[PDB]
Amino acid sequence: SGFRKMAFPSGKVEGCMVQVTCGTTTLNGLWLDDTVYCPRHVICTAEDMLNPNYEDLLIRKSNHSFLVQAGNVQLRVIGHSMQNCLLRLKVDTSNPKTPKYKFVRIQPGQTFSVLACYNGSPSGVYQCAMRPNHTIKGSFLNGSCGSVGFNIDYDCVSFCYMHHMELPTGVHAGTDLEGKFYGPFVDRQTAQAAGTDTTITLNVLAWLYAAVINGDRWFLNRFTTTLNDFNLVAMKYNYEPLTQDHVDILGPLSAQTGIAVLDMCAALKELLQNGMNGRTILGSTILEDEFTPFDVVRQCSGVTFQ
Amino acid sequence: SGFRKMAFPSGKVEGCMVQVTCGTTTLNGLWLDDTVYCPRHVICTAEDMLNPNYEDLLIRKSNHSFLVQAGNVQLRVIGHSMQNCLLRLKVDTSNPKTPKYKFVRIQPGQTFSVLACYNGSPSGVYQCAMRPNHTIKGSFLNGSCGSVGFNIDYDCVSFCYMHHMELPTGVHAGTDLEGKFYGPFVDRQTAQAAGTDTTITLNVLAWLYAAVINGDRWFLNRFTTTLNDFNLVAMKYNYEPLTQDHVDILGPLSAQTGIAVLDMCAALKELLQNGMNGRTILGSTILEDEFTPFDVVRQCSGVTFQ
Ligand SMILES: *[C@@H](CC(=O)OCC)[C@H](C[C@@H]1CCNC1=O)NC(=O)[C@H](Cc1ccccc1)NC(=O)OC(C)(C)C
Ligand SMILES: *[C@@H](CC(=O)OCC)[C@H](C[C@@H]1CCNC1=O)NC(=O)[C@H](Cc1ccccc1)NC(=O)OC(C)(C)C
């Protein structure tokens, strides 16, 4: 029993973290096989960030403009290319600790583990959701650029995020491992701001299922709703509209608890309208939206506490 | 910026997890040098748990009564002893991935990372506090016994918890790595229940400091309090009494924010009495008590956002 924000074990990723230096700028990089990935802004000074031309900045560098350090060992750079907002540095050595891996672009609402790193040294690990507005509510200080986000399935690491910047509201933005930003953000100094965010309806519903599987039914009611009537309420409280696809995704959790999705929606509609009347759900006084249906199935018992 | 429940990177611990089988019972064990640690209840059947005599159960076993599997490799047991509520199994091979390590008994209020494991295979990682009542609010299913809790300082792993059981309220109990239980619990089937718990005052105060360092001052006030007057309020709301030692511990956070401890206490007293008036602190609508002053210094900037 219990329910916690749980990250994937971080060891396969720790063995891939290195330090990348260009001039006086140091950040983190990711070393797989004979390649090191890092944010391209490693080539900028502070004044560069105000109007950088990356093609122009990069052509001015040689292979030996870059130092890469893995633990106490210097790797020698033998090639370099830009790919969108990342650099791909080729090095003299293949990483002996390279795990089976893939590069994946995750979708808003999905979750992943972040390994916070400084000077190529991992310091901590926590679970984040990709928000509808394409930011994450992370925890990052100076030196954290190039920290990665990932999921693990079987023994394969699916890398999905590399960290690049902080926005004025204190939330975080970055790219996938092809160097393409999540959201409309750019790696240069502008007046960019996070767009208005929304609550992830599917996840809140998944988490209510988790609460039932764990033994709590206090918030259920005798009612049902149509998809359309639910959404009118959803719009008023700044929740994402629920779709038939979201309804089908919740199929297995529905089957395990014997609670129809539209009946769970009626329960959520009542919580939105009346509040929680001083009560908690899985330890929480608010409606949680950072666990997916996959996260709930991974963590909860396959047997409901009836 | 940001503030998250952050666990230590788990890799050094993943390389120490093995599977231990006795008869039809399988659980996790911890392999350091040439020794494997695991809960002694691995030697019981279900009916045994109702009245087990462990000395009597153990003398009936040989070295080869135990199988230990590390990945795909069988380790051969060449000796065994009981130590309080753990078994210490000696094996044919020293763990090549043994990190620098210590065994430490943590104190109530302190935090650690848990690596949830099943069949010797790590599945997830999250941060817990040792509660005043000597339980943790973990997340554990069948097969999780022998999962460990730990902290990391520099490159040394300080092991502090091994998991043994779940209590009727759904919280968790276990031992240090000498096999001594945290709390008055025993590894046999009784009517044992978690004692009444208390909120960890020092941690709530640390977390308010974290909120100031991160840039928020909304909950401060013009008042001060004496230690004794604070505690009268503390008792009414089921918070631990604050001591001069707790006041001295908060010295560095106080210095970094320019907020005297007793002034922060007056702020907390007002929050207890008036609630939060619909507002949040570091994203939270309630007062959080699972971050220590050490946790705040580790995660937050050393420079206050004034
Ligand atoms: C990674 C690199 C770094 O630390 O540079 C300092 C010498 C930075 C990580 C940031 C820092 C605090 N949290 C966090 O997530 N990223 C940055 O500093 C970016 C660089 C950048 C500037 C302009 C456009 C894109 C990227 N800057 C940044 O995040 O701005 C602040 C912190 C001022 C809001
Ligand atoms: C580890 C061993 C196990 O899974 O045995 C099942 C064949 C168990 C971990 C528990 C299970 C659910 N969550 C969790 O933390 N521990 C136990 O099953 C203990 C064994 C025990 C019994 C009596 C006294 C001490 C230890 N039993 C247990 O936790 O009881 C329940 C789950 C019924 C409350």
Tell me the one-letter amino acid at A298. Answer: R
After which residues do gaps appear in chain B, with C to N over 2.5 Å? none
Q: How far is B194 from chain A (nearest CA, A)?
A: 15
Nearest to residue A230, comparing CAs of A219, A239, A220, A221? A239
- Contact in structure between B77 and B66 (CB atoms under 8 Å): yes
Q: How many CA atoms lie within 13 A of A65 on its CB side?
A: 16
Q: Is the CB of B38 under 6 A from ligand 2?
A: no
CB atoms within 10 A of CB A155: 10
User: Which amino acid does the sequence have at A256?
Assistant: Q
Distance CA B2, CA A239 (A): 23
Q: Let me know: does B3 contact B283? Beta carbons within 8 Å.
A: yes
The secondary structure of residue B184, as a DSSP letter, is: S
Which DSSP letter does residue B180 get? P
A139 interfaces chain B, CB cutoff of 8 Å: yes
b vs e for B17-42, b when ≥16 Cβ sit within 10 Å of the residue's Cβ? Answer: bbbbbbeebbbbbbbbebbbbbbbbb
Q: What strands lie across the sheet with B86-91, from one edge to the other?
A: B73-75, B67-70, B17-22, B25-32, B35-39, B86-91, B77-83
What torsion, rounded to 10 degrees, do the Cα atoms B256, B262, B264, B268 define? 160
Q: How far is CA A140 from the centre of its chain?
A: 13
The reply to whether ligand 1 has any atom less than 6 angstroms from the CB of A166 is yes
What distance in Å separates the CA atoms of residue B91 and residue B72, rounded to the nearest whole number?
A: 16
Inter-chain residue contact B123 with A286, CB threshold 8 Å: no
Cβ(B291)–Cβ(B206) below 8 Å: yes
3-class SS at A222? coil
The CA distance from A166 to the nearest CA of chain B, in Å, is 8
As a whole number of angstroms, the distance between CA A17 and CA A40 comes to: 16
Residue A160 is among the residues annotated as catalytic for this protein: no
Least Cα distance to B27 among B116, B146, B139 occurs for: B146
* Residue of A3, A4, A285 to mutate, interface with B, max B Cβ within 10 Å: A4
CA angle B198, B203, B209 (to 5 degrees): 145
Measured between alpha carbons, how far is A62 from B226 in angstroms, rounded to an integer?
A: 64
CA nearest A166 in B: which residue? B1
Strand-strand pairing, B156-166 and B100-103:
parallel
- Sequence-ordered list of residues with C-beta below 8 angstroms from that of A154, at least 6 positions apart, any chain: none
d(CA B72, CA B49) in angstroms, rounded, equals 30
Q: Is A246 a catalytic residue?
A: no
Show Cβ contacts of residue B261 under 8 Å, excluding neighbours closer than 6 positions. B205, B247, B250, B251, B254
Distance from CA of A170 to the nearest CA of B (A): 6
Ligand 1 mutation target, pool A44, A118, A142, A187, most atoms within 8 A of CB: A142
Answer yes or no: are the C-beta atoms of A164 and A69 closer than 8 Å: no
Cα separation, B125 vs A128, in Å, equals 13
DSSP state of A196: P
Question: Which residues lie across from B38 on neighbouring strands?
Answer: B87
Q: What method did the depositors use to determine the structure? A: X-ray
Token couple for B76: 């051969």
Distance CA B119, CA B262 (A): 49
Q: Which helix (H) or strand (E) element contains residue B39?
A: strand B35-39
Parallel, antiparallel, or unpaired for β A156-166 and A172-175?
Answer: antiparallel
Residue type for A6, please?
A: M
In this structure, the strands spanning B77-83 and B86-91 are antiparallel
* Ligand 2 pocket test target in B47, B142, B167, B189 with most atoms within 8 Å of CB: B142
CA pseudo-torsion sign A252, A257, A258, A264: negative
**Ligand in nearest proximity to the CA of A162:** 1
B134 lines ligand 2 (CB under 6 A): no
Q: Write phi, then psi, for A108 (nearest 5 degrees).
A: -55, 145
**Coil vs helix vs strand at B86:** strand
- Contact, B39 vs B183, CB < 8 A? no
Contact A137 B2 (CB under 8 A): yes
* DSSP string for residues in A116-149: EEETTEEEEEEEEE--TTS-B-----TT-TT-EE
Instruction: Assess B28–A contact: CB distance below 8 Å, yes or no.
Output: no
- DSSP H helical segments within A50-192, as ranges? 54-59
Strand, coil or helix: A101: strand
Query: A281 with A291: CB under 8 angstroms?
Result: no
- Residue whose C-alpha is closest to residue A203's, from A274, A148, A132: A132
Helix (H, G, I), strand (E, B) or coil at B155: coil
Structure tokens at A243: 């779709």
A129 Cα to chain B: minimum distance (Å): 12
d(C-alpha A184, C-alpha A55), whole Å: 20
Total number of residues shown for chain A: 306
Which backbone phi and psi does A38 adopt, to 5 degrees?
Answer: -160, 160
Q: How far apart are CA A257 and CA A252, in angstroms?
A: 9
C-alpha B139/C-alpha A296 separation (Å) is 12
Contact B33, B159 (CB under 8 A): no
Most distant CA pair in chain A, distance: 70
Write out the two tokens for A83.
């790919």
Ligand closest to CA A194: 1
For the Cβ of B185 lying below 6 angstroms from any atom of ligand 2, the answer is no
Q: Is the CB of A186 under 6 A from ligand 1?
A: no
User: In sequence order, which residues have a C-beta less than 8 Å from that of residue A217 and are 6 or more positions away?
Assistant: none
- Considering A16, A41, A80, A265, which one is annotated as catalytic? A41
Query: Is B126 part of the contact surface with chain A (CB cutoff 8 Å)?
Result: yes
Q: Is A25 on the interface with B (CB under 8 A)?
A: no
Q: Measure the CA–CA gap between B219 and B293, rounded to whole angstroms.
A: 19
Beta-sheet strand order (sheet of A25-32) = A73-75, A67-70, A17-22, A25-32, A35-39, A86-91, A77-83
DSSP lists the bridge partners of residue A98 as: none
Exposure string of A112-134, with b = 16+ CB inside 10 Å and e = fewer, is bbbbbbbebebbbbbbbbbbbbb
CA–CA gap between residue B177 and residue B12 (Å, rounded): 17
Q: How far apart are CA B27 and CA B117, in angstroms?
A: 9
Cα separation, B303 vs B285, in Å, equals: 25
DSSP 8-state secondary structure symbol assigned to residue A195: P
> In Å, what is the CA distance from A54 to each residue of A19, A44, A175?
21, 8, 16
CA B14 – CA A12 distance, rounded (Å): 10
User: Is some CB atom of chain B closer than 8 A to the CB atom of A72?
Assistant: no
Are the CB atoms for A117 and A123 separated by under 8 Å?
yes
In chain B, the domains with their CATH numbers are 1-14+100-197 (2.40.10.10), 15-99 (2.40.10.10), 198-301 (1.10.1840.10)
Task: Quote the distance between the C-alpha of residue B193 and its chain's center.
Answer: 18
Structure tokens at B261: 């401890």
Cβ proximity of A10 and A113 under 8 Å:
yes
Q: What 3-state DSSP class applies to B69? A: strand
Tokens for B209? 């400091």
Rounded to whole angstroms, how far apart are CA atoms B168 and A182? 44
Ligand 2 pocket: which of B19, B41, B165, B171 to mutate (most atoms within 8 A of CB): B165
Checking DSSP bridges between strand A86-91 and strand A35-39, what pairing results, if any? Answer: antiparallel
Whether the Cβ atoms of residue A11 and residue B15 lie closer than 8 Å to each other: yes
Angle at CA of residue B144, ends B141 and B148, nearest 5°: 130
Q: Which residues pair with B215 in a beta bridge?
A: none
Q: What is the DSSP string of B197-235?
A: P-B-HHHHHHHHHHHHHTT--TT--S----HHHHHHHHH
